Write a structure and sequence with these properties.
Chains A, B: 3CL-PRO exists as monomer and homodimer. Only the homodimer shows catalytic activity. Interacts with host FBXO22; this interaction promotes the proteasomal degradation of nsp5. Two copies of one chain form a homodimer. By secondary structure, chain A is an alpha+beta fold. Helix content of chain A is 22%, strand content 27%. The radius of gyration of chain A is 22 Å and the shape is elongated. The first copy, chain A, starts with 10 loop residues before the first helix and ends with a helix. Bound molecules: N-(4-methoxyphenyl)acetamide (T9V), chloride ion and sodium ion.
Chain lengths: 301, 301
């Protein structure tokens, strides 16, 4: 038993991380087979921050302008192209530590592990969720661009995030590994701000199911709710709408615990109204929304 | 910026994990050089676990009684001995993936990364503190025994923990890699309880500094205090005593923020008295005590 924010073992990703330098800018890249993926903003200088014309900046680059380093080894770049907001440096060596992998774009609410990296060297691993406003609440300092997010279901590494930038509110924005931003953001230093964030209701519910699995029952009640009444209440606390999809997804946890989804919704409505009254759930005094239904089942009995 | 509970990258340890089977029990082992380390209780049947005589049960065993599997490869066990509550299985092959490592014993209040494993296969990684009561608040299911905890210093893995058991309250107990328990526990199926735990004061303070560094500043104030006055409040709230050594260790963070420790203690005092019923610091409505000064500095530098 116990319940923790648990990251995937990072080794398979660690063997892919390299340092990319262009001009005076160094950041991280992801070396898979004979390609290194990194943020295209590596090719920007000081006066290319606001309105970079990436197609124009890149045509002016030769292969030798990019210094790629895997530990001590210099990798030799033999080709470059851009795909959306990701730069793809072709190298002369295929990475012998390339794992089984895929690229997947995730939806708000999904969780993944982040391997924070500086100068091509992994620093730490932690779990994030894609927030409803398409940001993530990470821990990123200067030099962390090109750090990636991933899952590892069944020995295959699914890459879903590459870190590009920190927005003014101290939250983080990035792309999938096809270079498409999550959310309305752009890789320019023009003023940008995240939308108002909301709580990931389906995840909070899954976490309440975790709590019950782990032997907590204090927050349950004898009430139920219609789905609609639930949404009308929860939205007043900036919770995301709960959809029939979400209800379907919780069916297994419902079944294992014997607590119908809408009954659990009733408990959540009450927790929102009352707070915790000095109590905690799974070691938190807040309602946690960064565990998916799938994370709960993975981690629990 | 941002502040997240972060594990060490786990790859150096993942390469060391194997499966160990003795009779009907399978659990995890740590393969370093030509030895596999696992809990001695692997040699126990359920009957045995009530009152085990390990000396006796072990002489009755032979090398072939232990099946050790690294991935899809059987290792040949060529020797077996016990050190305290750890079994040492000598095998015919040195682990080619052995990292630079040492075995260390950590102190209460210190943190480490746990690589949770099942059937020799790494499953997840998360950070834990060794509690004052010598338990850890982990996340472990049956099969997780022999999972290890570690820190990384430069390229040296310091192994400090091996998982042995869950206590009735849902908290976890284990040994160092030399088989010495953390805490007053024994490796037998008997009645055992964690002592009442206390809050790690210096870590709470470290985390208040992290909060300040990330622009969470509301809880600050003009006041200061003394060690003596504060400690009398700490005792009252089941906080560990704050020592001069703790104040010194927080020196960097006092410097960085302009808030002196006793200055921060004044803040913490008010928080213990006055509370935070539902209000938040770094996204928590609890006073978090599982980040050390080093954790805060390392993450925030
Ligand atoms: C299957 O038989 C056993 C024997 C021993 C344990 N555990 C401890 C701590 O003695 C568990 C199961
Ligand atoms: Cl998704
Ligand atoms: Na103060």
């Amino acid at each position: 038993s116990g319940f923790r924010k648990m990251a995937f073992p990072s080794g398979k990703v660690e063997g892919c991380m390299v340092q990319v330098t262009c001009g005076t800018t160094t950041l991280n890249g992801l070396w898979l087979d004979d390609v290194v993926y990194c943020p295209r903003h590596v090719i920007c200088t000081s006066e290319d921050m606001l309105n970079p014309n990436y197609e124009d900046l890149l045509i002016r680059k030769s292969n030798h302008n990019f210094l790629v380093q895997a530990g001590n080894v210099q990798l030799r770049v033999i080709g470059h192209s851009m795909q959306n907001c990701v730069l793809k440096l072709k190298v002369d060596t295929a990475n012998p530590k390339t794992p089984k992998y895929k690229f997947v774009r995730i939806q708000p609410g999904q969780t993944f592990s982040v391997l924070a990296c500086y100068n091509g060297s992994p620093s730490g691993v932690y779990q994030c969720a894609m927030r409803p406003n398409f940001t993530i609440k990470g821990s990123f300092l200067n030099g962390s661009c090109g750090s990636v997010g991933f899952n590892i279901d069944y020995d295959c590494v699914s890459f879903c995030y590459m870190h590009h930038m920190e927005l003014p509110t101290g939250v983080h924005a990035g792309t999938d590994l096809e270079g498409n931003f999550y959310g309305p953001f752009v890789d320019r230093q023009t003023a940008q701000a995240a939308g108002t964030d909301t709580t990931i209701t389906v995840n909070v519910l899954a976490w309440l199911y975790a709590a019950v699995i782990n032997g907590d029952r204090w927050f349950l009640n004898r009430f139920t709710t219609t789905l609609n009444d639930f949404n009308l209440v929860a939205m007043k606390y900036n919770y995301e709408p709960l959809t029939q999809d979400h209800v379907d997804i919780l069916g297994p946890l419902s079944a294992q615990t014997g607590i119908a989804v809408l009954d659990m919704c009733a408990s959540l409505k009450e927790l929102l109204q009352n707070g915790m009254n000095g109590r905690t759930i799974l070691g938190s005094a807040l309602l946690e929304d960064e565990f998916t239904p799938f994370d709960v089942v993975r981690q629990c009995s």
